[PDB]
Amino acid sequence: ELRVGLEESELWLRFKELTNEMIVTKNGRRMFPVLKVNVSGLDPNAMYSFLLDFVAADNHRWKYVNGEWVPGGKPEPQAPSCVYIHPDSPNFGAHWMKAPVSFSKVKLTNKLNGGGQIMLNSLHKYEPRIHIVRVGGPQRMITSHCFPETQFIAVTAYQNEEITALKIKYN
């Protein structure tokens, strides 16, 4: 049975309970904390790619008003984000199960850009999601997993200094 678990969930929970923020820049900014995923129950010999994308958690624009995040009143459809292919992809089940799969090199941007970077809408709330795609084999197969604990608002600068302080303390 394919088990997918969040590494350092205790750290992510400190961020979530303050409302997490991730910087987006024109050229793209790496994530802290990094999404790290513990995977077991793959076929050690089968061949898989690991994909990361970001679900808009709601259809609203958020704003930091009097020290608190509040949703706008005017929801718009949020298009699904583009997918980031983990650079170790494609790779054997054994490669993925031997250490946490770490998405340390994904860069979050607010502008349609060359390559690699994932474009997110500023002041939208996002839920990281992975897809494990069985490749090359006869039967293609996808398993998807969400990480509620890793939800964040995409921001061009930090609003809640409590987040700034946690980022610096643990980076």
Ligand SMILES: CC(=O)Nc1cc(C(=O)O)ccc1F
């Ligand atoms: C570099 C790499 O792994 N690419 C990729 C290929 C397929 C495919 O062949 O369907 C599915 C997912 C992927 F991420």
